[PDB]
Structure formats: C-alpha cells, structure tokens
C-alpha cells in the first residue's frame, strides 16, 4: 500500500477509497469515507498520507500504515472542496472551494483555520500548483483563471473565452506550457514567460484545440511534458503531443453499438513515471490502465459497486 | 335586401342550425337549398365564428363495465326529446328499464339524467302511450328504491 513504487488509489460515489496495484490489479485494501462522496484525491508529495476532498470536509488516511481510518480531519469549508494540491516539501495544502475561496491549509501544525484566503467571484474548480512553489493557479465557473502569487499577494485575472466554466487546469513540471480546459470542449494552451526571479509571469496565447465535442473535464501533462492528456464527456481521453498539438492517441470507452445511451463519462487520468502507461477513471465503475503508444487496455481495476470520479497515481522514489 | 354576414351577429346560432341540415335532411332540394342560403349569407373567417360563438373520452374517464351503460343512456336520452320519440318512445323506455334491471343499485348514478326528462315526457305525450310509461316508471321506482325520493313530488303530481 505504501511499499509499492506505483501507488494507485481510486474513488467516487460508492463511499470507499480502494487501493489497487499496477501489474496485477488485486485489491490490496479499502477504506470508508461515509457521510459524503469524494470530489478529488491526492497523495502527499513524500508518499506519507493521502487526501479525500469530500463535501464540507477533507480527510486524510495513512498510506504507509496498515488499516486506519483518517489521521487528520479538516472541516471549516461550508460547501464542496473541488480540488487539492500540496507543497512538494510537505508543509501546506492548497485547496479550492465551491464557496469561491481558494485557501491554504498548514499540515504540520494543527490549526482548524486557514493561513491565507483568496476570494474571487464564482466557485473554484481547479487548484493547480506551479512547479517552483510560489504561484498557485485558480480557475472557476465564469471563465476566470486567476494567477495568485503566494509571496507578493498579486492576483491577475484572465478570461480565454467569455463566461464558460473552465473546469480544470494543470501546468507541466517543465514550467514551459500551462493548459486549462473548459466546458465548451476546448483545451487552451498558454506559453510561459517563466517568472523565476522577476515575477514576469506573463502568458502568451498559443492554440485553441478543438479538443472534444462535449464537456472537457480534466487535462494533465505527463512528467516528460511531451504529452497533454484531456479526459472528457464523450467517453474519451484524447492525448495531445506537445510540438504540433495533433491527436497522437485517442482512448475511448464507447460501446461500439448503435444503442448505448451514455455508458458513463471519462472523468480523470494520470500518467506514469516513464509516460508509457496512462491510467483513467470512469463513471462505469472501471479504473483502467492503457498503453499511450497504441491505445491498448493493459489492465482493468473493477471493484467499485457504484461510480468513480478521481484517481491518485504516483511515480516517485 | 342584402342582409349578409350581419345575420351571423344578430341570430348568431344560424351556422350551427344550417350545417345540421346538410348532415340530416334526406332531400337534394332541401340539402341543395341549405347551400344556396350558406353561400348568400357568405363565408366566415373562422375567428369571426369563434367570436360569434364527451363521447370518446366518455370511455377515457371510466373503466369499461361502467362505460357501456353510460354511452347507451346518452344515445337513448338524445332520442328521448319529442320529435323522434313520436314513434320511438316505447323502445327507449324498454331499454332503460332493462339497463337498470341489469345494473343493481349502481343504476342510481344515471337518475338525475333520466328522471327530469322522463316525467316531462308523461305530461307531454299522448294517452296512446301513457298507460305504458307509468308501468315502466313503476319499474324504475322498484330498482332504484328509496333514491327516487327527490323526484317524488313530480311523480305524485303526475299521478294526481
């Protein structure tokens, strides 16, 4: 559970957090998350413990230790917690509210309050962390990607397309390109003027990708930063390659049948360390595992009785 | 005189009265003339008609056991109004009496439809029939039993 170099975990509306293994897919162990569902997971950056962003409450369960219920409980967020992040050292958690407020939460010291806030207009969907640990990128349900400097308290708003809820965002570990993805079915790539010592932090609009027909839901770069995976609500996970922005691979969990009235959407994905295998979650109980070259379903982690929304996938030593 | 369209205001029912003659009267001078009339009065913008102004869903309302008596009762009573009854009184009343006989006490629901017309028929009709109607009235009375009490005044007036 902690010992395996590929920690994979997964959850959704079934109230359980199941821990799979990469090679085989024998379920190692499971943990309860009652009273609620799980909006998104993340593992802490030293593989120590794992987060479950519920309704009204984050909780955190031990990954190293064998069979616990939660170590830490944070409440004090009076709607959903729609994302998480973590300081790569492991002191802070950078959350996002349904209540328009992207907080910060100290992990080491017990304090039920948040250290800082960043209030905006609409509910906060994505809370992704730029690699140098100084900028935090917050999107919302009115087009607005606010870039919030954690040192200088600056907040520069940015509307790619008018009004459309930008549903998720991520920035690569290179700090070369950022991609956020909206409900229209478009994946907007932003060229980084990499604000290291200056805080230039300017973005130059590269390309609108006609990514998907229906809602694009989660986009992510691989640790290589060669590949930009964009899950969606056309039960698809279209991988885009960095140089062209051309369709390198198209994963799909469609029926192959004239009558199949929505099997379930392709919610969230997460690359391997080598970026040869791409996991994905779906709203038909199936956390899968693919081959990024071809598009071949290398495993299938079917244990949930109801749906699955979020992953937690981990390569690191 | 050239009294045209104006008649559809003054005595506005006119169109409904004329368009029955085309769907009733078996003469191709009368049905012929009813067209000469309609024409001479002229045509109406049907909006002018909607200013100047059951049976299928009669199934829709009920389950079928209760449907059938209700339909028959309505057709029968549609005859049961003077002009057609001049010959076919007796026939109608024979049916009704058989209906109530067949229903039990669930017959009671039709009472307020039948009974007011029925008693007025007795006063109106000729004595050729009248001795028969009383025989059948007394038959209605027997099936219905105490439920006839509302109409009893009129009955006693008729007898008297």
């Amino acid at each position: 559970v902690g010992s395996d170099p590929v920690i994979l975990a997964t959850a959704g509306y079934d109230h359980t957090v199941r821990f799979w293994q990469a090679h085989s897919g024998i379920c190692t162990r499971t943990v309860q998350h009652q009273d609620s569902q799980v909006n998104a997971l993340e593992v802490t950056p030293d593989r120590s413990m794992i987060a479950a962003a519920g309704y009204q409450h984050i909780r955190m369960y031990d990954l190293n230790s064998n069979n616990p219920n939660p170590i830490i409980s944070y409440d004090g967020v009076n709607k959903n917690i729609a994302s998480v992040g973590f300081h790569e050292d492991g002191r802070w958690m950078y959350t996002g509210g349904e209540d328009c407020t992207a907080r910060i939460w100290d992990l080491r010291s017990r304090n039920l309050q948040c250290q800082r806030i960043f209030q905006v207009n609409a509910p906060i969907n994505c809370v992704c962390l730029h690699p140098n640990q100084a900028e935090l990128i917050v999107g919302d349900q009115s087009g607005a990607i606010h870039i919030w400097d954690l040192k200088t308290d600056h907040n520069e708003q940015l509307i790619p397309e008018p009004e459309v809820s930008i549903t998720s965002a991520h920035i690569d570990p290179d700090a070369s390109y950022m991609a956020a993805v909206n409900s229209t079915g478009n994946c907007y790539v932003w060229n980084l003027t990499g604000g290291i010592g200056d805080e230039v932090t300017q973005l130059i609009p590269k390309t609108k990708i006609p990514a998907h027909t229906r809602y694009a839901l989660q986009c992510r770069f691989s640790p290589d930063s060669t590949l930009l995976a964009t899950c969606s609500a056309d039960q698809t996970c279209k991988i885009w390659r960095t140089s062209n922005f051309s369709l390198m691979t198209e994963l799909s969990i469609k029926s192959g049948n004239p009558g199949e009235s929505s099997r379930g959407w392709m919610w969230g994905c997460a690359f391997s360390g080598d970026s040869q295998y791409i996991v994905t979650a779906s709203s038909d109980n199936l956390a899968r595992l693919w081959c990024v070259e071809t598009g071949e379903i290398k495993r299938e982690y079917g244990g949930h009785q109801k749906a699955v929304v979020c992953l937690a996938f981990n390569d690191s030593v | 005189t050239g009294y045209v369209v104006e008649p559809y205001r003054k005595y506005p029912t006119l169109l409904e009265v004329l368009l029955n003659f085309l769907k009733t009267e078996q003469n191709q001078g009368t049905r012929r003339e009813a067209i000469r009339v309609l024409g001479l009065l002229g045509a109406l913008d049907p909006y002018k008609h909607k200013v100047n102004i059951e049976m299928l869903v009669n199934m829709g309302n009920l389950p079928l056991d209760e449907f059938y008596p209700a339909v028959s009762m309505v057709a029968l009573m549609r005859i049961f109004r003077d002009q057609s009854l001049s010959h076919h009184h007796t026939m109608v009343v024979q049916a009704i009496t058989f209906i109530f006989k067949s229903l039990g006490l669930k017959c009671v629901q039709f009472l307020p439809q039948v009974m007011p017309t029925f008693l007025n028929v007795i006063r109106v009709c000729d004595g050729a029939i009248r001795e028969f109607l009383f025989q059948q009235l007394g038959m209605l009375v027997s099936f219905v039993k105490s439920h006839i009490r509302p109409y009893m005044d009129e009955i006693v007036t008729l007898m008297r």
Binding site: - | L19, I35, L38, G39, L44, P46, V71, L76, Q94
Partner: protein, 345 residues
C-alpha cells in the same frame, strides 16, 4: 355469439356508394346484437328502427365485440377493414373507420393490429384523402417517432401548411437543416412552404436538367397560379398536351381553365373545362361559368344546382369534426350562390 357476425365482416364485394354504406349499416347493427354488454344488446331493437342509434354507438359497439373475439376472428375482421379503407374511398365509411381507429387508440384494448405498424401509414394516407388534415398529422408524427427521413418531413411541412400552421412548417424545416444538411431536395418543399418564387427557381432548374416530365410541369404550373401569373401559365399549357397523358390532363385542365378565364380567352377555356370530369364539383362549376359568358341560364342553373348536390358530400365529410376545416367547402358554396347572383345581375 359470432356466426351471425361473420356475415357482415367480409361482405366487401361492393362497388358503388350505396353498396358500401349498406355494408356499414348492416355491420353496426350486427355488432349491437352480439355485444356481450346487456346495455348495448337492448338498443339493437331500437338501432334497426332508428339508424343514428347504431351510428353513434358504432365505436362503443365495436369495442364490446372486439374485446371478446378470437385471434383468427380479429384478423378476419381487420382484413376486411384494411380492404374497406384500401378498396373504395367513401367519405362516410373512411370517416367511420378512421374515427373507430382513433377511438381504439384512447382505449385500454390497444390500437387496431392493421398491417404491422398498427396501420399508421395506411390511416394517414386516407385521412389526407378525406381532408382530415389534423388526424392525418397525428399519424404522420407517429411515423416521425420511429426514426425520421426526408420523405416524412416533406409531407409533414405540407400537412402543417394545409392546417394553415406556417410557423410549425417553418419549424419542421429547421429540424431538416440541422440533421439532414445534405439531403435537401427542396423543389417540392418550397412549393409546400408557400415560398412560391423559390419553388419556381427549383422547378426551373429541375426542368432544364431532366426532360419535359408531366410531374415537374404540374408543380411548376401550380407555382404560377399560386403566384398569380396568367400569361406564363397559358404558355405552359399550350406547348404540352400530346407529350402529356390524359390522366395528368384531368389534373392540369383545372389550372388551365382558370388561366384562360384569367386572360379573357374563352374559346380556350371551353376546350379545357370539358377535360375536367362532370361528376366532380369543379367540372360542374366551370361548365356553369362558361354558360354565363355564353348566356345560357337554364343550363347554368342546372349545373350550379348539380354542383351543390355533389358538394353535399364535401360539406358532409368536413364539419362533422370542426367548422374550421368545413371552411374550404364554405367558400365554394359562397361562389355558387354568388354564381346565381351573377345571373340575376
């Protein structure tokens, strides 16, 4: 209970008006005798002596029978109903079976198992023949519900326009433009839409490419009289007669008579009117109209009065449901009785 019924089911060896009506009469009464409900049995006695008692209980009578009957016996019956609609369009046998068919849909019993669709295609045809346009649309939309096609939509915009419902027709066109973006053969569609100029463009194009067809001409002629153009319609008649059949010439000549009458060319009108059949309203009318120019009132009055007697059925089919649909026939009798006043003038 059924051996007496079987005589009136498929006794459909019938040819004139009287022959089919008398099939109907005898059927309705034959139903009433059988019908398992005592409260209909009762009426039979009356139903003979007064026939509108059988007429009005027909639908109800029919369900009381149909509820009991065997599967063999149901198909036996239905096959003669199929045949009664199919063979011979009698206003008052179609409009009694259509109204029976519609009665049957509101029922618990299910719709009538005709011809594998529940007869949707058949019954819609024969509503549009009757000028039962509203009923015709109900079934036409029931087709749409099981996967639409350009053919369904084409009709569905004419029929909506025949109900004088143009916003609904324009709506159906905007279904087409989304889902059938290519298929778009709109030469007839513009003509049905009441976009008469664009229809005339599309039939100009279709008569340039393909040959002198009678069907493309009939549509392109209907475009001109719907625009109003008399001079041009008289040209489209003059050229094509020997190339055209005599069946199309019965359809065509009506437009032609009105056109020649349009241009004060009476000699031509006389030729065209004779082509129209005498037993129709129209034939009677134009014969009467010619007679009024010629100045022959006795003959004219007879034709007028003949036309009225034929019009009886058109006014007797429409108005049984709604006055709004009767309105077509109402304009004809308006003309006739005004035709009379032309004489007196």
């Amino acid at each position: 209970s059924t051996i007496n019924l079987q005589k009136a089911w498929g006794a459909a060896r019938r040819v004139s008006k009287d022959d089919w009506l008398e099939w109907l009469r005898r059927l309705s009464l034959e139903l009433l005798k059988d019908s398992s409900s005592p409260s209909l049995r009762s009426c039979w006695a009356l139903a003979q002596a007064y026939n509108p008692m059988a007429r009005d209980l027909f639908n109800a009578a029919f369900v009381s029978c149909w509820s009991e009957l065997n599967e063999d016996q149901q198909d036996e019956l239905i096959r003669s109903i199929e045949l009664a609609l199919t063979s011979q369009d009698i206003a008052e046998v179609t409009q009694t079976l259509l109204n029976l068919a519609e009665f049957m849909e509101h029922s618990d019993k299910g719709p009538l198992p005709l011809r594998d669709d529940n007869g949707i295609v058949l019954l819609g045809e024969r509503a549009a023949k009757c000028r039962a346009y509203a009923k015709a649309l109900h079934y036409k939309e029931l087709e749409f519900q099981k996967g639409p096609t350009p053919a369904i939509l084409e009709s569905l915009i004419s029929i909506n326009n025949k109900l004088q419902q143009p916003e609904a027709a324009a709506g159906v066109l905007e279904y087409a433009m989304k889902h059938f973006g290519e298929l778009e053969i709109q030469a007839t569609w513009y003509e049905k839409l009441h976009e008469w100029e664009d229809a005339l463009v599309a039939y100009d194009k279709k008569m340039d490419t393909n040959k002198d067809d009678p069907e493309l001409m009939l549509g392109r002629m209907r475009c001109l009289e719907a625009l109003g153009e008399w001079g041009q319609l008289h040209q489209q008649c003059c050229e094509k007669w020997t190339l055209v059949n005599d069946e199309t010439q019965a359809k065509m000549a009506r437009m032609a008579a009105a056109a020649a009458w349009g241009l004060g060319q009476w000699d031509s009108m006389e030729e065209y009117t004779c082509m129209i059949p005498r037993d129709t309203h129209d034939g009677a009318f134009y014969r009467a109209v010619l007679a009024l120019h010629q100045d022959l009132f006795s003959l004219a009055q007879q034709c007028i009065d003949k036309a009225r007697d034929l019009l009886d059925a058109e006014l007797t089919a429409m108005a049984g449901e709604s006055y709004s649909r009767a309105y077509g026939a109402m304009v004809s009798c308006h003309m006739l009785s005004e035709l009379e006043e032309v004489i007196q003038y």
